[PDB]
């Protein structure tokens, strides 16, 4: 699905077309913004520390592990998504890449089956 690339400060560098469809923000709008704009509180207010923490401690909590989290669209609606984060480097600087898998349908089908 969506692909997002951020620098070591959480600023969006690349935003794929699928990402635009999934999150509602366009490439130009998202580029130059903190990745925290795609998530809700409390994570939103702590995400920077999350990244900050990893840069010194070097202890992966998600990198190479993957996790299902809640994403937030521009219109404020939240949805579940699987996220895998990869670490890379360019220009001697660190970059993080996130691969997103929308699980909205999976969750809806599950809730519906649970309801019937
Ligand atoms: C939109 C939803 C997202 C949410 C809610 C989210 C949530 C989190 C959480 C909970 C942590 C801390 C994990 C822990 O303390 O165990 C974390 C760490 C991190 N996130 Fe995200 N994140 C999101 C998107 C992204 C994206 C798109 C990127 C990068 C392209 C990113 C990069 C990072 C990095 C680099 C870390 C630290 C590395 C690590 O702990 O393994 N996150 N995130």
From Swiss-Prot:
CC terms in the record's Gene Ontology section: plasma membrane
Domain PAS: 1-55
Chain's role: Putative oxygen sensor; modulates the activity of FixJ, a transcriptional activator of nitrogen fixation fixK gene. FixL probably acts as a kinase that phosphorylates FixJ.
Binding-site residues for heme, renumbered to this chain: 47
Gene designation per UniProt: fixL
Protein name in the entry: Sensor protein FixL
Assigned keywords, A-Z: ATP-binding, Heme, Iron, Kinase, Metal-binding, Nitrogen fixation, Nucleotide-binding, Phosphoprotein, Repeat, Transferase, Two-component regulatory system
Highest rank taxon of the organism: Bacteria
GO molecular function: ATP binding; histidine phosphotransfer kinase activity; metal ion binding; phosphorelay sensor kinase activity
Coverage span on the entire protein: 154 to 269 of 505
Occurrences of domain PAC (ranges): 56-115
Example of a GO biological process term: phosphorelay signal transduction system
């Amino acid at each position: 699905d969506a692909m997002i690339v951020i620098d070591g400060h959480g600023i969006i560098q690349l935003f794929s077309t699928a990402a635009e469809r999934l999150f509602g923000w366009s490439e130009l709008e998202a580029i130059g913004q903190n990745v925290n704009i795609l998530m809700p509180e409390p994570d939103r207010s702590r995400h920077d520390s999350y990244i900050s923490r990893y840069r010194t401690t070097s202890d992966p909590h998600i990198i190479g592990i993957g996790r299902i989290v809640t994403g937030k669209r521009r219109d404020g609606t939240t949805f579940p998504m699987h996220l895998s984060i990869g670490e890379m480097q360019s220009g001697g600087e660190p970059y993080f890449t996130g691969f997103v898998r929308d699980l909205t349908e999976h969750q809806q089908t599950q809730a519906r089956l649970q309801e019937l």
